[PDB]
Design a protein around this ligand. Structure first.
Ligand code: K3O
Ligand code: MG
Ligand code: ZN
Length: 313
């Protein structure tokens, strides 16, 4: 309980910024997460022995895929940490606990394939969950690990508080289904502009937390250009492997997933920034002003893809 985690000076400082990269040393990522939990929540919120044991099982249950891996989990969790720390007073004690956990667990047991692929393959998970297939699986794996011996990090919550926190985690993980994001953001944009947005309405908080989840999930686009550029390589390696699996089912994949259409990548990045990424950080910034650095970093990267097209790189 008198056992603060501490990081080297460069990490102690840069971990507080939205555009932090956690680095290539896998063995520090557990310590980085615990440091964030302790600074975001308290040294008191979790039992150190139980939390370490949870983190290491969560890591074990992520797979060796190019993008949707353990590094993605910890990266998404760091962006949540930076939102929460810039928005000190806005969030309950349960929310601070639930959200860093949700982010670490949001892609548990990802195989590097989209909901679409699972449905077209006729994967058993598509029979068990007609919508948000993989996200209901990720939540399912999160509960499973919570139920392992010595892994209930929520042990000191009441039956009531426990059920609220698992319900935060559940909604937070479903919201990472990007198909759900577009309507979530429209509704939020309308609520904000007709001035009906009320963070005391649980049903409003839910939508705000879903947007935070999309934002943290998409956060490769809020990094400095060299991180953004090299992360895009991992994203497309997964997309093209799926395209290959689509071609084996006898289905032309969408060009995003077709590795024969590598040339179209920069124009695709533009659409993505324009249709998804910018709207997302803009609406988030309107609701939570201190998140403006994510919007700014995204605008910077849109500008770098526009220079890729004009062949200035
Ligand atoms: C276009 C390039 N995509 C992406 N590019 C980057 N940099 N980050 C990303 N994270 C998720 C996607 C993604 C996943 C599924 C569907 C789509 C959509 F374009 F349909 F919205 C997008 C994505
Ligand atoms: Mg996911
Ligand atoms: Zn994710």
């Amino acid at each position: 309980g008198l056992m603060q985690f501490t990081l080297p000076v460069r990490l102690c400082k840069e971990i507080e910024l939205f555009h932090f990269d956690i680095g290539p040393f896998e063995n520090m990522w557990p310590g980085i997460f615990v440091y964030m939990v302790h600074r975001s929540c308290g040294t008191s919120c979790f039992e150190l022995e139980k939390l370490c044991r949870f983190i290491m099982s969560v890591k074990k249950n992520y797979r060796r895929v190019p993008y949707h891996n353990w590094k993605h989990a910890v990266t998404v969790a760091h962006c949540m940490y930076a939102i929460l720390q810039n928005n000190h007073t806005l969030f309950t004690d349960l929310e601070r606990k639930g959200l860093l956990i949700a982010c670490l667990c949001h892609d548990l047991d990802h195989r590097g394939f989209s909901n679409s692929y699972l449905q077209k393959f006729d994967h058993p998970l598509a029979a068990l969950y007609s919508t948000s297939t993989m996200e209901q699986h990720h939540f399912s794996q999160t509960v499973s690990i919570l139920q392992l011996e010595g892994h209930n990090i929520f042990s000191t919550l009441s039956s009531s508080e426990y059920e609220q926190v698992l319900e935060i985690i559940r909604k937070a993980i479903i919201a990472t289904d990007l198909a759900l994001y577009f309507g979530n953001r429209k509704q939020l944009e309308e609520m904000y502009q007709t001035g009906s947005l009320n963070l005391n309405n649980q049903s409003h908080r839910d939508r705000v937390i879903g947007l935070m989840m999309t934002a943290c999930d998409l956060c490769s686009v809020t990094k400095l250009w060299p991180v953004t550029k090299l992360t895009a390589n991992d994203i497309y390696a997964e997309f093209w492997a799926e395209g290959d699996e689509m071609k084996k089912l006898g289905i032309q994949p969408i060009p995003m997933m077709d590795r024969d259409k590598k040339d179209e990548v920069p124009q695709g990045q533009l659409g993505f920034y324009n249709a998804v990424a910018i709207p997302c950080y803009t609406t988030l910034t309107q609701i939570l002003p201190p998140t403006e650095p994510l919007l700014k970093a995204c605008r910077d990267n849109l500008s770098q893809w526009e220079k890729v097209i004009r062949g200035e790189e």
